[PDB]
Design a protein around this ligand. Structure first.
Ligand SMILES: O=C(O)c1ccc(-c2ccccc2)nc1
Length: 168
């Protein structure tokens, strides 16, 4: 149904809300939810752990089966697997982990995976355990994504700083 409500429109195609991405997935019933994936699709932490727990581990079971046959993703890459109970599809997208020395330039590649989907529910890529500056990640999103992206930021403080920064 893609029933997004209460988003702030930043550009013609990028929207943002102070919300929990799992609660958004349940309310919105999106065609695609984006996962903040790692190359091995091990969803023990971060946004990935929240999405996987909300699927009662079905996302991890499917991901383990996928990797054993198909091999790992690349940093800046993506795969499309089931959305389970959250969405029709899950776009697993690997942003660079700058906490572990990966090149922040790969964030552009990472957001280019969104352009194969008309409308997405997504977290801010490379945030949290991935260690990137969130203000920078929002700029790369706005500059790179051409399809409609609905960004869920749960931390109110961070949401307020992102919005303030974007409106400067
Ligand atoms: O046709 C669509 O875009 C579409 C279809 C199903 C869903 C869907 C939503 C929640 C759980 C499973 C699937 N979302 C979007």
């Amino acid at each position: 149904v893609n029933s997004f409500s209460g988003y702030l429109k930043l550009t013609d195609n990028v929207y943002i809300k102070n919300a929990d991405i799992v609660e958004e997935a349940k309310k919105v019933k999106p065609t695609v939810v984006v996962n903040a994936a790692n190359v091995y699709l091990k969803h023990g932490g971060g946004v990935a752990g929240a999405l996987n727990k909300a699927t009662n581990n079905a996302m991890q079971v499917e991901s383990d089966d996928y990797i054993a046959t198909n091999g790992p993703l690349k940093v800046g890459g993506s795969c499309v697997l089931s959305g389970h109970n959250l969405a029709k599809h899950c776009l697993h997208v690997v942003g660079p982990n700058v906490n572990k020395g990966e090149d922040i330039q790969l964030l552009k590649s990472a957001y280019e995976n969104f352009n194969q989907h008309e409308v997405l529910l997504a977290p801010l890529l490379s945030a949290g355990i991935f260690g990137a500056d969130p203000i920078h990640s929002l700029r790369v999103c706005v500059d790179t994504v051409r399809t409609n992206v609905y960004l869920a930021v749960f931390d109110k403080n961070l949401y307020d700083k992102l919005v303030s920064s974007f409106l400067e």
